[PDB]
Design a protein around this ligand. Sequence first.
Ligand code: NA
Ligand code: NA
Ligand code: NA
Ligand code: NA
Ligand code: NA
Ligand code: NA
Lengths: 6, 6, 5, 6, 5, 5, 164, 163, 164, 163, 163, 163
Amino acid sequence: DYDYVH
Amino acid sequence: DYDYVH
Amino acid sequence: YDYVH
Amino acid sequence: DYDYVH
Amino acid sequence: YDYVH
Amino acid sequence: DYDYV
Amino acid sequence: MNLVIALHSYEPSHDGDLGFEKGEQLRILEQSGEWWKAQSLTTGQEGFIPFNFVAKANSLEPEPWFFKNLSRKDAERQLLAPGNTHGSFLIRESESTAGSFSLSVRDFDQNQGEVVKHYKIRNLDNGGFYISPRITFPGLHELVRHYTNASDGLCTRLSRPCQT
Amino acid sequence: NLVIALHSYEPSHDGDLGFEKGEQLRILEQSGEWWKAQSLTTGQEGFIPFNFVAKANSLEPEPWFFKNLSRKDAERQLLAPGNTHGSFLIRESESTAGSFSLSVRDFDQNQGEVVKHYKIRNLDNGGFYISPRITFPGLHELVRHYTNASDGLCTRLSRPCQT
Amino acid sequence: MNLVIALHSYEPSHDGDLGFEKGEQLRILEQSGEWWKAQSLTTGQEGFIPFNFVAKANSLEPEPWFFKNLSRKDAERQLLAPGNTHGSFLIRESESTAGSFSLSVRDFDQNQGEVVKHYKIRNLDNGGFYISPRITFPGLHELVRHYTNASDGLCTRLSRPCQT
Amino acid sequence: NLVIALHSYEPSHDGDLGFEKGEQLRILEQSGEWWKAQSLTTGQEGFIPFNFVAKANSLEPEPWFFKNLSRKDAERQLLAPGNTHGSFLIRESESTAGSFSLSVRDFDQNQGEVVKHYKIRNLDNGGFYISPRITFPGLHELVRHYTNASDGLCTRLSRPCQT
Amino acid sequence: NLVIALHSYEPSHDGDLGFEKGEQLRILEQSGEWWKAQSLTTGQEGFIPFNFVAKANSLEPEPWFFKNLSRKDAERQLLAPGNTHGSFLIRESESTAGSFSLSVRDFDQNQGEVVKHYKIRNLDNGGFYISPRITFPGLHELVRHYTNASDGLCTRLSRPCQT
Amino acid sequence: NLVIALHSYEPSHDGDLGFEKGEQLRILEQSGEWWKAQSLTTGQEGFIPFNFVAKANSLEPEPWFFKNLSRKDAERQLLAPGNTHGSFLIRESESTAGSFSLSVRDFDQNQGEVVKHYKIRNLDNGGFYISPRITFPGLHELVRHYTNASDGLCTRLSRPCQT
Ligand code: NA
Ligand code: NA
Ligand code: NA
Ligand code: NA
Ligand code: NA
Ligand code: NA
């Protein structure tokens, strides 16, 4: 799993 | 209650 | 008189 | 002639 | 402590 | 002579 | 139709300007940044007007982000439902206070995933609105516009109206 | 209204709308950074990143566009009553049969009001720029940007020329 | 900043805030950026207030840059007098168009050298002011404060008040 | 409103008040970037560049400064009634010699109202900094900066702790 | 420093070096907005506009790139001593053949030292992006941008991973 | 790539390279805010905050530093072909010993191609400045600032004078 930009 | 200018 | 830019 | 940007 | 976050 | 900011 | 109300009276400053009085209604023809092309509903005269001298007169009901009869829990329910993501928001009538409205928006967090923050849109004497005393607004329309392009005060920007 | 996909986009978040590069879309909402769009090939709806597309709407309608217009004609139209500092218009370059020029009215001390001209260079891909500092996928984006900032120009683009 | 008048009514939202109704007169104890420590002349309770909600209430006469009884020529010359330079400014009340104020600021023209440009300060309905409809102020203090930190529109920022 | 001249300054513009490094001046008017001041040495008055001086006033009077205040009392005195998100204060570093510490009340999701601590390192020439990014000639300048921008800290220094 | 032309640039200023899309250039100087370059095709020299080109050097050498580096190795690497908050690196994606991934060390309140992973998407005629809000001609430009500003990342890419 | 420390730095983030005031350092990488560097005193390397050091390399090697150049000769060289608005250079002053002057070519709506000269005032302890609003530790930093921002000059420093 990855993260992301706000 | 609510949130605010964090 | 002058004005805004 | 053009008053080109500077 | 906490550094410049 | 000189120009200023 | 794009209706606006004059917040203040305006005396034409430059050629091509349209003069008007406070309270007067106008329709917006063209949006040109700070100056707008408007037509007086009173005289049918056209000209340019300073955008910050007016406020959207259109009703809030037709807005994609307004949900008159929506509860605090319902907002969370829909905002968190799939088809929405961080940035999704809506405006509803305040539950803890009448005559007021509340801002609900879905945000992310490292701790808990998607979450739902609720901000109380406090009313102003002259009828204005604001979430933070730092910035006030003449109407909920303007408020939404502001926070859709900047989040100053909020965790996230009002990215998109809640979807069903 | 109508926008062309400058790049392909694979849906990333919920409610997003994927589209192939060079696709025709119909804007439904302009919620700042994310727009509500609809494909003219799938009819499917969703949100798209505004910078992955560009106004596809013809220019003829545009208030600031004036195709059949001579350079000296622009200066008259712009200097005539009804206009002021920051009044502009885009014509079809007199010299080059294909380019465009930006004409803007401003002030001066050596002389009163004046009309400055700017050559709008082209891009291999089909974009436009006046300053190599910022480029654009189309003239709409170009006029949209210079009306919100005098990024290099002599004066912000206040308002479209008034007949 | 010694005394201000609440432009709006504010309800305590944070522990330590000082509530107040529009028009109320408040005394500034300490300025903390966006939250100033105030004292209600009415109630007399100390508290924190949002600066955006108030406007300087003190007289203009003492202001370094104000020169009420001063004609255009008198202002235009004083600015060119020694002791002043580009960016020197002042505000006077137009003898002609009474009730209206004017702003005079010295600048250098690479063609005509030293010159003094004049700008009218239009009156707003609510009682505010403005030079450019783009930005409005509830009082001349706010306006100066604004244009001494950014010349948005003006040929130059209002650097320094005129000197004798 | 006393300041100390960080550098010498020769008058560049008419109306300017020139001064030597180390001189003390009284600030009369704060006109943005050019302040109106009086030399405490010669009695002369003029305009000076605000960034060439620093507050010479004492630290005691300052609402946000507390000389002998333990770190535990700071946390207790801070989470007490009358204070909220943004409340802060500065006290001497109890962990480092000749230093200062910044304590401000913030808020965490799963932690609630918490109290963060930042140490103010000393600069060779006597300045200060929380972040090497920006340095300050004095503590007053440091507080001023952060109350006007969360330039690194989790929140802008809103209000000085209330007894 | 080698670069490739993303568009064609026609000279409009003196000392300006013109070039065609796809042409490789050699960067001699870096004057902010304008860079003194030397053509590899012609051998001519002049000033070019920095956003019309992108780094043509190989990625291998870059201090933040690391080919054969698994996601676990990257995490194990970023968490290794001698690194902190903002330490990062780009590796080949395990979940997407032909893609890259951005790994950056961050700090949380509940689990302290953490390692975030951002998928780096590809663009049609070349290009990459993490957020459809900003696109980039190549990874070099992408890193340059997120080191001087973190719009979305939970930290600015302060310094490439250290071995 | 040889810098000198203006202040001392105590390692904070794991990976920092500590250093004392005036210490010599060679810069290896410019990761925006932090620079990888190496001590010419301990041989140990690491990250340092960039505003704590200043380029200590020689001046002559600079593309814009023409030591023995006259106020008039500069105007002759600047107005020469191959240069334009924004072209500039710094010369050893001839109106104040131990001083430097900034000459740049700008465009006037009256005289035409013109050349302006700005006196670069020296500061108390080896610093420099044209505007008291901003001061710098060295001419290198001064140029860097004004090439990336025409903060005060009605003209931005685009390219150094091209002989
Ligand atoms: Na609705
Ligand atoms: Na048209
Ligand atoms: Na007065
Ligand atoms: Na105290
Ligand atoms: Na590598
Ligand atoms: Na040289």
